[PDB]
Amino acid sequence: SMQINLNSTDPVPSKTPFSVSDADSYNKKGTVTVYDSQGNAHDMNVYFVK
């Protein structure tokens, strides 16, 4: 689950590229840790782009 609260007035026009680094292309970078079949941790990076 992931309860997200976003600011209604936060746009991303500064950039369009991603590659988990182009800060300007997104508004929020969240990471959810999840487990695979051996429990190995994984980094669910989630990007919110208005």
């Binding site: 970078k29 969240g30 990471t31 840790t33 989630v46």
Partner: protein
């Protein structure tokens, strides 16, 4: 401490959000990584704009 880690005494590691990029930025959506403070050098950064 001698490992460049913030601790109490106790001795436990103080955690926080990791920094990334140049200049570093705070990944608030990232997991609460151990805070460390390297004593190594800031690399020169070419002028990009002026």
């Amino acid at each position: 401490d001698e490992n460049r880690n913030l601790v109490n005494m106790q001795g436990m590691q103080l955690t926080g959000y990791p920094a990334t990029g140049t200049p570093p930025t705070i990944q608030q959506g990232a997991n609460p990584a151990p805070i460390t403070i390297p004593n190594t050098l800031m690399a020169a950064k070419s002028t990009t704009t002026a």
